[PDB]
Amino acid sequence: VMNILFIMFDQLRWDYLSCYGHKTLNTPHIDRLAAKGVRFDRAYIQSPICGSSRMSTYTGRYVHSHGASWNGIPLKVGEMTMGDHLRAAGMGCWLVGKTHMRADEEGMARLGLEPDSLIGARVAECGFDVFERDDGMLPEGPDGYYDPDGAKEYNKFLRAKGYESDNPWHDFANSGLDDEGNVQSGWFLKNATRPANIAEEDSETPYLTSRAMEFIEQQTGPWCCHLSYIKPHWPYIVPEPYASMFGPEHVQDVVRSDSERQNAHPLFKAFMDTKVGEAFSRQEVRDAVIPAYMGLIKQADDQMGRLFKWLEDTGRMQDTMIVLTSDHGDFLGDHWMGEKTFFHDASTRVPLIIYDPRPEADATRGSVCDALVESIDLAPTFVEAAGGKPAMHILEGESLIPILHGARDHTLRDHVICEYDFSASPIAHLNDISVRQAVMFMVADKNWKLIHFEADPRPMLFDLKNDPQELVDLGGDPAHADVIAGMYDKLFRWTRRQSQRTTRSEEQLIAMRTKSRKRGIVLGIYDENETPLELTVKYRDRKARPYKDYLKG
């Protein structure tokens, strides 16, 4: 039986792995996975924020199709998920870590789905059976917890080892400590320079790695395990030795220009003119945060070394497909922005490495695929991997198995799509854009990236071949009107897709074309000679009496 180990890191940039070219951050264990598999050089997520990116990946569907369009927007009860597609192919689907799922409680109540039943618990958890659900943080303020269940098992783990605090996740894993015993919260970016006040083996990435091994040891039958880490997502703080390993001298140059800010499209400027944008535009903030970010990733690589060594030693490596990816990047000050909520590659292009242990993937080991790839491709890839037939009237991406197995070196699509709905975001609050206007679309191929705003008639446009850093907006350039028209055609073609026709497969639709004519539907037939007599056997040669004769009783 082949198993699938679906590994994801939150907020990990494509260019912060050495196999993707980082100059000072060496990630040999992840690089080694790539050397025995395929590295995807052009992989894009479908929304630049945790919740909606993940919901797209777990459904294999675009945000425009599934409707879970921002953090905390529930995925509706009707939408089937990865776990559903895999279980129909005989493979279990399990969670170790983060999903950012919010149950559609209203929808469940409407259909009488109980959250404590097998079917109900799965719907509430985005199709996963849960080994451990942890979205990876326990923030709190005057109105309470962002997520009361954050770090629930992790805090029990720390308290059992002897840590004591009314928030051990905060005080140890995500804060430093000064000489006088004062907790230095990792929520303050200046404290990113401090080592986390925790034994390194007890911090979050090593913890979740141990949990993955515990799951794998226990689980029989074919399984898919979504191993889903919160780091390098904030708080940006890491234990020794990773804390001391990097400094500002190791940070790659920020990618931005004065002209870019001067000539910023009004909606682009809006995302720069935020607390986070202005913060990460400051040298002292990048000097503190980015070496910590790097340390988090180096720690991840060491834990992948640990995990992969264990799969090898226990003989599981030859029967486990491994996928390694991210839900989105982090601008880290690039383009005068912080966080991730815009369309430049620094956020929307993600690392993606796939290792298929089977001999049919031998021909492509160590190769680099430069074809247009979307995160929604993972679901049909997994179904095919599990020996199933991907239901392509529901799943909108494409299986990557033909690429892995050397049947072709490219996908079939001619463009990728990303979407961002900021109707629920603090930023629409400030610029008071209407809910209906607070949305943007991205369409890109190898040559161009077009950004459409519903709140502004002018698009943004980047020449990806000659401006790969995406610093020069050509959206207002008359010389590019034809190119802009062409990309808009691509976006329009995509919006017209029939993504909601999920209740009949293409084969079933074709079969319906000839069914009714033999079931008595007779149209445009004047007399019995105008259609085959076989079709009207139920209608001809019949006898009856005048109706009055049946009624005179």
Q: Which parts of 311-350 interact with Zn ion (CB under 5 A)?
A: 327
Across 334-362, b (16+ Cβ under 10 Å) vs e yields: bbbbbbbbbbbbbbbbbbbbbbbbeeebe
Contact status: 208 vs Zn ion (CB under 5 A)? no
Contact status: 503 vs a copy of itself (CB under 8 A)? yes
Instruction: Pick one of 54, 66, 298, 344: the residue that binds a copy of itself (CB under 8 A).
Output: 66
Task: Please identify, using beta-carbon distances, which residue of 392 and 471 lies nearer to a copy of itself.
Answer: 392
Q: Which parts of 353-412 interact with a copy of itself (CB under 8 A)?
A: none
Q: Give me the least distance between CB of 232 and Zn ion, in Å please.
A: 10
Q: Give me the least distance between CB of 48 and a copy of itself, in Å please.
A: 15
Task: Please identify, using beta-carbon distances, which residue of 156 and 446 lies nearer to a copy of itself.
Answer: 156
Contact status: 272 vs Zn ion (CB under 5 A)? no
Q: What character string, x for contact with Zn ion (CB under 5 A) and - otherwise, covers 438-467?
A: ------------------------------
Number of residues that bind a copy of itself (CB under 8 A): 135
| DSSP summary character for residue 517 | G
Which pair of structure tokens corresponds to residue 202?
A: 């007890």
3-state secondary structure of 120: helix
Contact status: 134 vs Zn ion (CB under 5 A)? no
CA neighbor of 41 nearest in space, from 357, 300, 416, 397: 416
Query: What count of residues does the chain have?
Result: 553
Measured between alpha carbons, how far is 329 from 8 in angstroms, rounded to an integer?
12
| DSSP summary character for residue 238 | B
Tell me which of a copy of itself, Zn ion, none is bound by residue 50, counting a contact when its beta carbon lies within the kind-specific cut-off of 5 to 8 angstroms.
Answer: Zn ion
**Residue matched to tokens 């029967």:** 319
Q: Give me the least distance between CB of 361 and a copy of itself, in Å please.
A: 29
Contact status: 253 vs a copy of itself (CB under 8 A)? no
Tell me which of Zn ion, a copy of itself, none is bound by residue 210, counting a contact when its beta carbon lies within the kind-specific cut-off of 5 to 8 angstroms.
Answer: none
Which pair of structure tokens corresponds to residue 510?
A: 């074709």
CA neighbor of 357 nearest in space, from 318, 310, 313: 318
Enumerate the β-bridge partners of residue 323.
6, 354
Q: Give me the least distance between CB of 50 and Zn ion, in Å please.
A: 3
Which pair of structure tokens corresponds to residue 294?
A: 């790097």
Measured between alpha carbons, how far is 231 from 303 in angstroms, rounded to an integer?
12
Contact status: 204 vs Zn ion (CB under 5 A)? no
Contact status: 524 vs a copy of itself (CB under 8 A)? yes
Contact status: 482 vs a copy of itself (CB under 8 A)? no
Tell me which of a copy of itself, Zn ion, none is bound by residue 345, counting a contact when its beta carbon lies within the kind-specific cut-off of 5 to 8 angstroms.
Answer: none
Q: Which residue has its beta carbon closest to Zn ion?
A: 50
Answer for the pair 137, 146: CB distance below 8 angstroms, yes or no.
yes
Instruction: Pick one of 274, 325, 381, 411: the residue that binds a copy of itself (CB under 8 A).
Output: 274
Q: What character string, x for contact with Zn ion (CB under 5 A) and - otherwise, covers 45-84?
A: -----x----------------------------------
- Give phi and psi for 48, each to the nearest 5: -85, 50
Measured between alpha carbons, how far is 13 from 345 in angstroms, rounded to an integer?
9
CA neighbor of 228 nearest in space, from 3, 5, 2: 5
Q: Which parts of 93-132 interact with a copy of itself (CB under 8 A)?
A: 104, 106-107, 110-113, 117, 119, 123
Task: Please identify, using beta-carbon distances, which residue of 190 and 410 lies nearer to a copy of itself.
Answer: 190
Task: Please identify, using beta-carbon distances, which residue of 221 and 546 lies nearer to a copy of itself.
Answer: 546
Tell me which of a copy of itself, Zn ion, none is bound by residue 503, counting a contact when its beta carbon lies within the kind-specific cut-off of 5 to 8 angstroms.
Answer: a copy of itself
Measured between alpha carbons, how far is 406 from 404 in angstroms, rounded to an integer?
6
Q: Give me the least distance between CB of 543 and a copy of itself, in Å please.
A: 5
Handedness of CA 187, 13, 231, 11 (dihedral sign): positive
Contact status: 124 vs Zn ion (CB under 5 A)? no
The annotation places the binding site for Zn(2+) at: 10, 50, 327-328
